[PDB]
Amino acid sequence: KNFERCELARTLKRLGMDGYRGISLANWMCLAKWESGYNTRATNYNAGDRSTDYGIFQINSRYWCNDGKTPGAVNACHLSCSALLQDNIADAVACAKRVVRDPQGIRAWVAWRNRCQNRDVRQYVQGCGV
Numbered sequence: 001k002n003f004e005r006c007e008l009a010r011t012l013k014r015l016g017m018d019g020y021r022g023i024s025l026a027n028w029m030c031l032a033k034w035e036s037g038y039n040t041r042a043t044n045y046n047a048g049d050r051s052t053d054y055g056i057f058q059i060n061s062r063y064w065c066n067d068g069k070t071p072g073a074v075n076a077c078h079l080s081c082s083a084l085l086q087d088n089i090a091d092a093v094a095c096a097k098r099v100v101r102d103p104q105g106i107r108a109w110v111a112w113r114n115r116c117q118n119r120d121v122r123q124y125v126q127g128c129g130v
Helices: 005-014 025-036 081-085 090-100 110-115
Strands: 043-046 051-054
Touching: 005 025, 025 110, 051 081, 081 090
Parallel strands: none
Antiparallel strands: 043 051
């Protein structure tokens, strides 16, 4: 499913993402935008280390979810990577929260550092009623 901007903003807000561990909704939107373009079915195989990024947040199989084909991987979110490919983003949001509970916080995603950190992210939630 490809979410429309404001639709996603409220979906994330209802899921408890607004200010989760100090992370604003605009930051989460900027993350999803640059990671998948708001596409829940987005996937990226990393030939270099044999891992795969799944869903709207492009969560990696090496540490977060289990797909059974990533060498020496763990499943910190305790989810089949398949759960990160559903139209319903509840499980992906639960896993994204797990990711940020670690020391790096939102910085875990390099794309957030590249395109959201110290950037004007207000545009992501303007007019969405959040």
